[PDB]
Paper text:
The gamma-tubulin ring complex (γ-TuRC) is the principal microtubule nucleation template in vertebrates. Microtubules are formed de novo in a process termed nucleation, which is spatially and temporally highly controlled by γ-tubulin complexes, composed of γ-tubulin1 and associated γ-tubulin-complex proteins (GCP). In most eukaryotes, microtubules are templated from a preassembled γ-tubulin ring complex (γ-TuRC) that determines the position and direction of microtubule growth. Here, we used cryo-EM to identify and characterize γ-TuRC assembly intermediates after recombinant expression of the complex, which allowed us to delineate a comprehensive stepwise assembly pathway from a stable 6-spoked core to the mature 14-spoked γ-TuRC, identifying successive stabilization and conformational locking of γ-TuSC units as central principles in the assembly process.
To confirm the correct assembly of the γ-TuRC in our recombinant expression system, we first analyzed the consensus structure of fully assembled γ-TuRC and large assembly intermediates (10–12 spokes) to increase the sample size. For this set of particles, we obtained a cryo-EM reconstruction at 7.5 Å global resolution. Structural features of the cryo-EM density indicated that all GCP variants have been incorporated into the complex in the correct order and that the lumenal bridge was formed correctly, including stable integration of actin and two copies of MZT1. Unexpectedly, we identified three previously unresolved MZT1-GCP3 modules and one MZT1-GCP5 module (see below) on the outer surface of the γ-TuRC, associated with the GRIP2 domains of GCP3 subunits (right). Having located the MZT1-GCP5 module on GCP3(8) and the MZT1-GCP6 module as part of the lumenal bridge, the four additional MZT1-containing modules resolved on GCP3(2), GCP3(4), GCP3(6), and GCP3(14) of larger assembly intermediates and the fully assembled γ-TuRC represent the remaining four MZT1-GCP3 modules. While the MZT1-GCP modules may play a role during γ-TuRC assembly by providing extended intersubunit interfaces, we could observe these modules not only in assembly intermediates but also in the fully assembled complex, indicating that their association with the outer surface of the γ-TuRC is not merely an effect of an incomplete assembly process. Instead, alternative patterns of post-translational modifications on the recombinant γ-TuRC could be an important factor in stabilizing or destabilizing the association of the MZT1-modules on the outer surface of the complex.
Author numbering:
A (entry chain f): 7 to 113
B (entry chain B): 485 to 504, 524 to 815, 823 to 893
C (entry chain P): 3 to 41, 45 to 93, 101 to 177, 180 to 279, 287 to 306, 313 to 447
The structure:
């Protein structure tokens, strides 16, 4: 639609409060996203995938570390997302290590 | 093959020293003789500049923990930072410890070169990381002898290190458990109320010290020593460099195939993690029961002093209530200990009959070593 | 870590001096304490490190009425040791009372080594039960030891005094010593004087100079028990991790020792394993069943066949076993020690927990009973009367050994959930 209302759909999804139930949390989202909305930084999608693999080795989820490698092939393959660096950077930043659990997810 | 020797010899090993069908077959007379000279010299000079054999000998002892002495002192200094989060620590802290252990042990009689190459690192941290979750020593490979130490081979040796580190740690954690059990069964020797729960906690601990201690010897005679013998046999024979790295491809594959990194039996390591967590639960419970016991002892001591503070009665009525509390707290302690006991039994049963389903003869050998009595594995109730 | 040994009594000082001489022979060192120029091993287990690296043994020289200590004094091994640990009755009570009055200076010597040492791991006692000099003094010192340090270890080496039967109060003295030994010690190395006597007569024609020869046997035992600590291996390079496996409960810490050489004046593991499992290769003497068995082998062996060896003994079912929670036969392999003449390298060792020793305790229990019932074997000693007017220490030791023999027999049962 437009990025200002699209930030407001995100505040309706994460919070259990709507857009007029709270607009102050939405006011924090415009505090950060504004002055950072446009790309001005170097981005390479090769490295951020190679840090999700290096994290899944450290999780000892070693079947899914090689299952991400076949799913990361599909991420380039379909290619409807303009920046494939951003969504992987987001999920990598929101990570944790709930230790070893092996066992493939069968994609 | 000879032109892959001489050209390699003159540029990366840096020796400018000399090395010099109906077509009557002139070739075969000279070629083999030239070979018999050149390849032996490439495999003599390179060892006496940066040793290939000495650093791979040191790799078994210091990184794969074969030394014993040094790893014991290194773990008597680095204990608090590894029971702490590794999200709040960095490399130089870990580096500072190392010098003290190398001077104190018999690494002071070893050459300066192997100590200089020996250094610690801390890898990229998990967002919930602790010192036991990831940690490694480095002992970095450099020089032209990294033609035997493949980059992938070193990247797998720290993957080995973490599992070995865990098992070697748990053998000192259980031994703190046994030490506290001792120490506070010679402080509590005259009380009747605690004797049952004490003896049941100790009987619970002694099956575990056993189970893990005899697992540790399978690691000694198969995973490290028998894989070091095959390396020594295939370095003793070798006529070219390509065999020395082929042995290096066996000195990893044996280790990772028997330390459960292989694909068929990851499910077994997922069960082996839980017994370590149960040992943690046993630590919690023993420290709590001896804390309640230290509290009764201190209650008895303040009882002892109140008598002489009164006489020179009116303190017995306060004592009977404390005695009543301590006497009624006993069956709850019994109930928690028996749940932990049955839990551990019900997982040891699944573990020992899973070695008699898994792939490869090697892991079936472990199941015999753990129980000779047929206490488990024939009769699943505790005989 | 750092282990301090303790020796008291004339017999204990004898076996300690023989042990340190035996390690001077074992290691590549001079009798000056000086390492030779062709010398590897760890020398931080029992060697206090002097500054010429005089590897001074961490043993405290304790005695009463010194007689053989004068022979210890004039020796070429008196320059090997002496960190100034030397010190100036044949009964329990007199040794006890004289021990308490001089306890401060010996504890000063203890603190001198202990703060003088780097760290501390345990106190290993050389002791003879009912030795006269050893009894009383050692029991009082053991009381001082655990009371002073609850964070430390105490292991004892104790002989069982039976030389085919004169000191007639020796049952009472032994009762007091083993009463302290069960409740105030952390691990006990029990030795049988009769079994070692039978083997010493077996190998030789000797009966009279027996002490010197069994000293050879026992020093091979103590060296073997700490060889995996002194030498770079991988497991049981600490005392406590060695001790912790065999003990299921803190009153069962009594250790039967086995040894395949008897007359010591290719090869493989499966032979000596089934050799050792037979109890005439054990130099210590209803149904009895082992609680836990541990083997360590030192010699010329191929390690790659040992799992097939272990497979065989699993098909043997050669020891009946204890019907509760799991124990196994527990194998370790150590390096054969260099720097000494090494003929017949292969020698095995069995450290095991067995119930049959309770019967040996029952022998003393029987003997004490008849002497107590005769009213005739205290002989009215002034130390015994003044220290104890009511003579209730015999009662306390008797109920303790009764509870212990009941613990033995209840552990023999398939139920040890019940009280012992």
């Amino acid at each position: 639609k437009s990025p200002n209302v699209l930030l407001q759909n995100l505040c309706c999804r994460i919070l259990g409060r709507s857009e007029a139930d709270v607009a102050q949390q939405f006011q924090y989202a415009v505090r950060v996203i504004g002055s950072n909305f446009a790309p001005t930084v170097e981005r390479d999608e090769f490295l951020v995938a190679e840090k999700i693999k290096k994290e899944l080795i450290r999780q000892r989820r070693e079947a899914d570390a090689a299952l991400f490698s076949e799913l990361h092939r599909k991420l380039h393959s379909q290619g409807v997302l303009k920046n494939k660096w951003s969504i992987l950077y987001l999920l990598l930043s929101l990570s944790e290590d709930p230790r070893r659990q092996p066992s493939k997810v069968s994609s | 093959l000879i032109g892959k020797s001489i050209n390699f010899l003159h540029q990366v090993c840096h020796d400018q020293t000399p090395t010099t069908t109906d077509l009557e077959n002139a070739f075969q007379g000279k070629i083999d003789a030239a070979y018999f000279e050149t390849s032996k010299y490439l495999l003599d000079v390179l060892n006496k500049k940066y040793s290939l054999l000495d650093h791979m000998q040191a790799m078994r002892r210091y990184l794969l923990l074969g030394q014993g002495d040094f790893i014991r002192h290194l773990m008597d200094l680095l204990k608090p930072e590894l029971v702490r989060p590794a999200t709040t620590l960095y490399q130089h802290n870990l580096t500072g410890i190392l010098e003290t252990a190398v001077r104190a042990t018999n690494a002071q009689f070893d050459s300066p070169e192997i100590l200089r190459r020996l250094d610690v690192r801390l890898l990229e941290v998990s967002p919930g990381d602790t010192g036991w979750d990831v940690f490694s020593l480095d002992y970095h490979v450099d020089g032209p002898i990294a033609t035997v130490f493949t980059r992938e081979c070193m990247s797998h040796y720290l993957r080995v290190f973490n599992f070995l580190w865990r098992a070697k740690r748990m053998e000192y954690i259980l031994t703190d458990i046994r030490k506290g059990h001792m120490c506070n069964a010679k402080l509590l020797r005259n009380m009747p109320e605690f004797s049952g729960v004490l003896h049941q906690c100790h009987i619970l601990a002694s099956e575990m010290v056993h189970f893990i201690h005899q697992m540790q010897y399978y690691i000694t005679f198969e995973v490290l020593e028998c894989s070091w013998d095959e390396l020594w046999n295939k370095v003793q024979q070798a006529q070219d460099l390509d065999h020395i790295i082929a042995a290096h491809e066996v000195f990893l594959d044996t280790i990772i195939s028997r330390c459960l990194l292989d694909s068929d039996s990851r499910a077994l390591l997922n069960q082996l993690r839980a017994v370590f967590d149960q040992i943690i639960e046993l630590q919690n419970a023993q420290d709590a029961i001896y804390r309640a016991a230290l509290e009764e002892l201190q209650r008895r001591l303040q009882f002892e002093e109140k008598k002489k503070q009164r006489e020179i009665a009116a303190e017995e009525e306060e004592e009977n209530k404390r005695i009543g509390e301590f006497k009624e707290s006993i069956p709850k302690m019994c109930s928690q200990l028996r749940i932990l006991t049955h839990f551990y039994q019900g997982i040891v049963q699944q573990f020992l009959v899973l070695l008699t389903t898994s792939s490869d003869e090697s892991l079936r050998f472990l199941s015999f070593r753990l129980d000779f009595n047929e206490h488990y594995k024939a009769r699943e109730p505790r005989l | 870590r750092e282990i301090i040994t303790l020796q008291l009594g004339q017999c204990g000082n004898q076996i300690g001096f023989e042990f340190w001489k035996q390690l001077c022979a074992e290691h590549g060192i001079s009798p000056e304490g000086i390492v030779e120029e062709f010398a590897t091993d760890r020398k931080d287990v029992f060697f206090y490190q002097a500054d010429d690296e005089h590897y001074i043994p961490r043993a405290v020289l304790l005695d009463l009425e010194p007689r053989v200590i004068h022979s210890i004094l004039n020796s070429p091994y008196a320059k090997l040791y002496n960190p100034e640990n030397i010190y100036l009755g044949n009964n329990w009570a007199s040794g006890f009372s004289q021990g308490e009055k001089i306890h401060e200076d010996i504890f000063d010597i203890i603190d001198r080594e202990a703060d003088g040492s780097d760290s501390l791991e345990g106190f290993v006692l050389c002791h003879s039960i009912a030795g006269g000099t050893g009894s009383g003094l050692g029991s009082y010192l053991l009381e001082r030891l655990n009371d002073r340090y609850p964070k430390k270890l105490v292991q004892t080496y104790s002989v069982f005094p039976n030389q085919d039967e004169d000191v007639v109060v020796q049952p009472y003295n032994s009762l007091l010593t083993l009463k302290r030994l069960t409740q105030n010690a952390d691990c006990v190395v029990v030795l049988d004087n009769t079994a070692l006597n039978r083997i010493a007569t077996d190998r030789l024609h000797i009966q009279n100079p027996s002490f010197s020869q069994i000293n050879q046997l026992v020093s091979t035992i103590m060296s073997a028990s700490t060889t995996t600590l002194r030498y770079p291996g991988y497991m049981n390079n600490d005392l406590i991790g060695l001790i912790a496996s065999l003990i299921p409960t803190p009153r069962l810490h009594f250790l039967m020792t086995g040894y395949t050489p008897l007359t010591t004046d290719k090869t493989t593991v499966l032979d000596v394993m089934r050799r050792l499992l037979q109890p005439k290769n054990v130099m210590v003497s209803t149904n009895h069943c082992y609680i836990a068995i541990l083997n360590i082998i030192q010699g010329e062996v191929d390690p790659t066949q040992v799992h097939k060896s272990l497979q065989r003994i699993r098909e043997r079912k050669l020891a009946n076993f204890i019907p509760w929670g799991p124990a196994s036969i527990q194998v370790a392999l150590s390096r054969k020690s260099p720097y000494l003449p090494s003929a017949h390298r292969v020698s095995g060792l069995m450290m095991a927990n067995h119930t049959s020793i309770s019967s040996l305790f029952e022998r003393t229990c029987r003997q004490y009973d008849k002497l107590r019932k005769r009213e005739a074997f205290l002989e009215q000693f002034r130390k015994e009367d003044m220290f104890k007017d009511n003579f209730d220490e015999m009662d306390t030791s008797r109920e303790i050994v009764q509870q212990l023999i009941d613990e033995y027999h209840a552990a023999t049962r398939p139920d040890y959930i019940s009280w012992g």
